[PDB]
Structure formats: structure tokens, C-alpha cells
Enzyme design. Structure first.
Site, PDB file in Angstrom:
ATOM      1  N   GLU B 172      -6.527  -4.072   4.505  1.00 17.77           N
ATOM      2  CA  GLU B 172      -8.013  -3.886   4.922  1.00 17.77           C
ATOM      3  C   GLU B 172      -8.121  -4.084   3.343  1.00 17.77           C
ATOM      4  O   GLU B 172      -7.657  -4.026   2.843  1.00 17.77           O
ATOM      5  CB  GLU B 172      -8.640  -2.827   5.466  1.00 17.77           C
ATOM      6  CG  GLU B 172      -8.281  -1.413   5.170  1.00 17.77           C
ATOM      7  CD  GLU B 172      -8.484  -1.245   4.324  1.00 17.77           C
ATOM      8  OE1 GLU B 172      -9.049  -1.389   3.045  1.00 17.77           O
ATOM      9  OE2 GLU B 172      -7.268  -0.191   3.271  1.00 17.77           O
ATOM     10  N   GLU B 315      -5.566  -3.221   0.757  1.00 20.89           N
ATOM     11  CA  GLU B 315      -5.375  -4.797   1.269  1.00 20.89           C
ATOM     12  C   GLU B 315      -4.446  -5.122   1.753  1.00 20.89           C
ATOM     13  O   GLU B 315      -3.686  -6.392   2.161  1.00 20.89           O
ATOM     14  CB  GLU B 315      -5.066  -5.194  -0.167  1.00 20.89           C
ATOM     15  CG  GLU B 315      -5.990  -4.741  -1.479  1.00 20.89           C
ATOM     16  CD  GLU B 315      -6.376  -5.471  -2.306  1.00 20.89           C
ATOM     17  OE1 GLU B 315      -5.124  -6.236  -2.878  1.00 20.89           O
ATOM     18  OE2 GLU B 315      -7.150  -4.926  -2.941  1.00 20.89           O
TER      19      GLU B 315
END
Ligand SMILES: Nc1ncnc2[nH]cnc12
Ligand SMILES: Nc1ncnc2[nH]cnc12
Lengths: 348, 348
Positions: B172, B315
Site C-alpha cells: 500500500e 509499499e
């Protein structure tokens, strides 16, 4: 000569490390967000053989093979010949370390420092004797023998560096090897044998007691001096252990990094650091061995492994498995973008 | 429809797993010596999309990006635009996940599920809204919205499978995201907010208090039902969180493995498992996030990560870093030699 070797181990380059840190701080991420990967990168940049930056050229895993007289004490369930068999298999690429090294793009070097069998074609010959002395009743070898093997291996190691190798991994192969390893750990850390003796290669729980006793015996009989790593290695170690220590000294002299493996490797590292504290900054832990005395050994080395795999195979398999992590720290350092270039501004 | 999707998640193949276990036991090593690598291999063999064996084809990391209204509560020090900036950077290959994925040979998919900015060319458009509602004063979104995004992402995920992808990683990107993540964890685990609220992207210690308060407020105001994962996600989650959960459901429906990342990912996993317990066997932990509520979250998922890197970037960087481990389990399974072929006989 060894005193030379030892004297010439380089200190880490603080200048390169400061430059690396600054660079890392400026990358496209919140500062310190990559945790241990950052720390690792900085550590590498300080290694003189690396040319002031985290980099990885060729990779090699050195596997030290040897037999132990202590096998006769009933401390291991693997038949003795397994050492010799597995060593040959190493030449065929079918072993655990072989498969993992190939996956990491590393080359495996099989070194015979004392297998109790005929020479194996394809294996590097550095044989001291056909297996070391039984530590339960006397020393594994003479000081001279240990010192010479240290020199010999260290040289072989630094020579590979000359051929493009920038990252080493160390491993061993030898039936009954967790016995000398426990003794060494006990002596260096001052822990009682019960606390550091494990099951090794599937030793049955019943048989443990005897193993603990053998360890105590070895120590009592030999009286190894803890402040003398060479004394310890020669008395209650093994050729394989000496060899691993030699890889460590060699890579440090060469100013290059070495990835540890498991328990056996921790034992050797303890010796290496005792012998030359300057070796420390060159060592990189891989995994957290499932061997019982692992936590104690790591604590004494003040090391926290990156990988928790409950592995206990040996051979340098853990070292191989961690190579990609080292490469990741380099990739991070070199390929990430910079905050400034994005106009991004984040609080320290 | 979602009930369908959920109904059709396959159970693991016990037959394949038994065959894998047997095979593993016969390899050139002491049984169980490769610890977690063995367990992982067996787990993979049970995944129907893998064709009864541990295998890895193409790899993809799906990065879910979105903004959060809760940012207005002073819970994050990164400027809001960083989400949009970093998302674009994802398209240029300069981010942390980008570099690590390339090192693992994985492709990164950047999915915009709700960034508060104009659309970014190159980014997969699945935008729900320009950032979700501020959870401190109401719900993040409607149930309908959450359900639709779940469906949409799950489908996209299973469709990649159709293109050769066998291994996914989830990640994310979204400023203020550790806030909804903590709320979710608190609700699902029944832990107090103080226990699970961390510093996220370098939040100053002073500002913590306020973050804990915002979390409690969100919960009190919304009254999310812990036995309803969709209820929880919609109320105190975010679009990004919903998206991650959707990847999980999608891969499970597809009978394929998903590598988790950090804290945010654990939150989503908790939701996924609540929604469909059948998802569990498809999840693979990567690293142990340095976020405060990490231990609690992992305990509830009964997961023990392989990597201890003190990472807190997000990420999907941790997921990428673990891909080689998954590949190692396959290599082990397929390339190692057999004991029998060596005439070696070792006690179980
Ligand atoms: N706050 C943040 N800033 C920059 N890059 C990030 N990647 C994930 N979180 C980030
Ligand atoms: N006891 C053992 N048997 C087979 N392979 C091994 N590799 C390391 N130790 C071993």
C-alpha cells in the site's frame, strides 16, 4: 606469518560510511524506514575491499569438510562416511548448499581439511590428517597444525578476492561437528555444557546426556584457555572449525564481508573475534540456527540474524540464502531515486 | 457476486501435501533439517493454482494507493501530496518497492483506489473517491463501496493468474495509513489503542497521544462490529485497506499464494480471515514490521515472519524482499538429490 596477517587487518573506512549514510538519508523514503537494510548498506560501505560503496561482485561459499575422532564417543547418529559421501555430492551440485548457492548465483568451494577417507577428486585438498583427535581424551590437534591451517585457508580466501570475489559465505560438513562446536561455545561464553549442547543431526533425546558429558570431559581434560582462541580451537575444536575461522580472518585481511551460517559458524566466529577483534566488523549474520546453544552464541557475538528459518542443516546453506539480502541493500543504495529530485520534504 | 467468490475459495490439497512431505523427507539431508523451508514447500504444494508442486512462475506486487480523510486530524507528518507523488514515481521504477521487486524479478502493479489528486497516467484506475472519509467523525465509506471494491480487486487479481502469475505480494501507499490500520487491529484483536498505535512515517513522540485519541474516537463513533470484517473495513478502514484485502481474497479464490508486507498488510489480513477463514492457508508472512502493533497483529494471525529487518517503509517492499525465499523452497524441492541414490541411511 600469522602475526603479520593479523596485524594487517584494516579498520573500517569511517569516511565512506559517513558518505553512505548521507546518501541513504536522501533516498525516496522516510528516513530510517528501511531499517536493517540501511545499516547493512553502511556496514558494507566501510569495507575497504569494496571500494567505498555497497557493492557485490562475485560470490563464493567455502565449505570446510573434516571428520572428528569424537564421533567414537557415540555423540552422532550419522554414519561417519556421510562426510565423505556428501563432500563428493558437493561436487555434483546436489546438496542443500549447492542448490541454494545456485539460486543466489554463488559458486561453492569444497575444501577438504581432514576427511577420514581417500581424497575426493574435485575437492580442494588441504587435508591435515584423516580426521582430528578425539577431544574427549586429548586435543584435536597441535597448535602448529592449527596455526598452519589458519594461514593456508586465509591465503586461499584472500586470493579468491583477487579473482573478483567480493562476498563470502562460510560453511562446514563433518559428522559429529556440533560436539566440538558446543565445547567451544561453552568455553568462550562460560556457559555450562547443558545449556549449549543440542541435537545436531537428529540425535535422539535419550542420547543427549552422554553428549553433555563428552563436552565436559573434553574441557576438563584439555583445559583450553578462553583468552587464547588458537588454544581453544586446537584443543577442543576440529580442522573444519579451524578452516572456518581462517575464512573469516582471510576475508577481513582482504577487507571483505563474510556471511556466517549456523551454530558451527558462530563457534568459529567467537574464536576469530578472540584472536582478532578487528575481524568483527566484516562479519554478517545470516540466519538464526535451530541448534540449542544458538541464542547464547549470538548474544556473545552481539549479532541479530536476519532470517528465522529454524534451519539446522549446515553446509553454508543459511549463508547462501542470505546473499540476496546483501544484494538488496546494494540495489537499494544504488537504484532508488532521491527525495530532492521529487521536491519532497520529510521531517528527519 | 461476493458470496459466490467467497464460497468458491478452494481448500488446500491434502494429497499433494502428503506427496510433497514424503519427497522432502527423502532428500539429501537429515530429515526436517531445512526447517521452515520444508514447511513452506509443503504449504505451496497444497495450493491448487500451483499444480500439486511447489512452483513459482511469474511474480507480481500489487500496490494499493489511496488518501485518507483522517490526515486532517494531524496524525501524519508527510504532506498529503506525497501519495500522489510517490504513486507516479512507482511508474518510473525509483521507489523502494520498485527496486526490490526488480531485484526479485517481480513486476509491480500500481493501483489507484482513491488518491486525492488528478489521475496519474500509467496507474491502474480503480478510484472510488478522492480520498476516503475521515474516520474520526464517521465512516471511511459505505458498505456498498467496500463490497464493490473487494469484487473489483479480487477479479483483477485472479485475472493476472490467467497471465502466468503464480505468486503475489501485496502493498500500500497512502499518507496517514497507519491510523486506520491501528483502529482495525484494535477492533479485531480487542487490544487497546495505546498498545497498537505506532509512529508510522516518523511521527514525533509528542504527537502520539493525539493519534491514540483519534483511533479511540473512530472506534467509539463508528461502532464497527468485529465479527463483520466488511463492517470494520468500511467504517474504520480505507480504500487501500479494502484493496489489499481484495488481493488476498482474489489470490485465494485463484488458489494461489500471497506474500504479506507489514503492519498495514496485517490489518487487511485480519479482515480477510474474518471475512473468509478459508483465505488463511494462502497467506505467507514476509517480514516482521517495526511498527508497534506488529506483534499483536501477528499473534492474532498466528504468523511468524521469516525476515527481521526492522522495516517500516510499506509499499510491499517486505513482500518483494521475501520472494527469493519462496523461490528457494521450490529450488530445494526440485533440485536436491536423494538420500537413497547415495546409499545414505539416516534415522528419522
Ligand atoms: N511517507 C512516505 N514517504 C515516501 N515514500 C513512502 N513510501 C511509503 N510511505 C512513504
Ligand atoms: N548429517 C548430515 N547428513 C547429510 N547431509 C548433511 N549435510 C550436513 N550435515 C549432514
Amino acid at each position: 606469518t600469522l602475526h603479520a596477517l593479523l596485524r594487517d587487518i584494516p579498520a573500517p573506512d569511517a569516511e565512506a560510511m559517513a558518505r553512505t549514510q548521507q546518501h541513504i538519508d536522501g533516498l525516496l523514503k522516510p528516513p530510517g524506514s528501511l531499517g536493517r537494510l540501511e545499516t547493512l548498506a553502511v556496514q558494507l560501505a566501510g569495507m575497504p575491499g569494496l571500494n567505498g560503496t555497497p557493492q557485490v561482485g562475485e560470490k563464493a561459499v567455502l565449505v570446510m569438510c573434516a571428520d572428528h575422532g569424537v564421533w567414537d564417543e557415540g555423540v552422532a547418529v550419522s554414519p561417519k562416511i556421510v562426510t565423505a559421501i556428501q563432500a563428493a555430492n558437493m561436487t555434483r551440485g546436489t546438496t542443500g548448499v549447492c542448490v541454494l548457492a545456485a539460486q543466489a548465483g554463488a559458486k561453492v568451494h569444497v575444501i577438504d581439511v581432514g576427511i577420514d577417507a581417500e581424497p575426493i577428486p574435485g575437492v580442494v585438498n588441504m587435508r591435515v590428517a584423516r580426521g582430528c583427535g578425539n577431544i574427549a581424551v586429548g586435543p584435536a590437534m597441535s597448535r602448529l597444525q592449527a596455526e598452519a591451517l589458519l594461514l593456508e585457508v586465509s591465503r586461499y580466501t584472500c586470493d579468491l578476492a583477487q579473482r573478483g570475489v567480493t562476498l563470502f559465505g562460510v560453511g562446514e560438513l563433518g559428522m559429529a561437528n556440533t560436539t566440538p562446536a558446543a565445547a567451544m561455545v561453552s568455553v568462550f561464553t562460560g556457559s555450562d555444557a547443558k545449556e549449549v549442547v543440542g541435537i545436531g543431526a537428529n540425535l535422539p533425546p535419550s542420547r543427549i546426556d552422554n553428549k553433555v558429558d563428552v563436552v565436559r570431559r573434553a574441557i576438563a581434560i584439555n583445559q583450553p584457555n578462553p583468552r587464547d582462541g588458537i588454544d581453544v580451537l586446537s584443543k577442543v575444536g576440529g580442522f573444519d572449525l579451524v578452516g572456518m575461522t581462517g575464512v573469516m580472518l582471510g576475508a577481513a585481511r582482504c577487507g571483505l564481508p563474510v556471511l556466517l551460517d549456523g551454530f558451527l559458524s558462530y563457534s568459529a566466529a567467537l574464536a576469530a573475534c578472540q584472536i582478532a577483534p578487528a575481524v568483527r566488523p566484516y562479519l554478517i549474520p545470516s540466519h538464526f540456527s535451530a541448534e540449542k546453544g544458538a541464542r547464547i552464541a549470538l548474544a556473545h557475538l552481539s549479532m541479530e540474524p536476519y532470517l528465522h528459518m529454524a534451519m539446522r542443516l549446515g553446509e553454508g546453506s543459511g549463508a547462501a540464502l542470505a546473499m540476496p539480502i546483501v544484494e538488496a541493500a546494494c540495489a537499494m543504495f544504488h537504484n532508488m531515486g532521491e527525495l530532492a529530485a521529487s521536491n519532497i520534504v520529510l521531517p528527519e
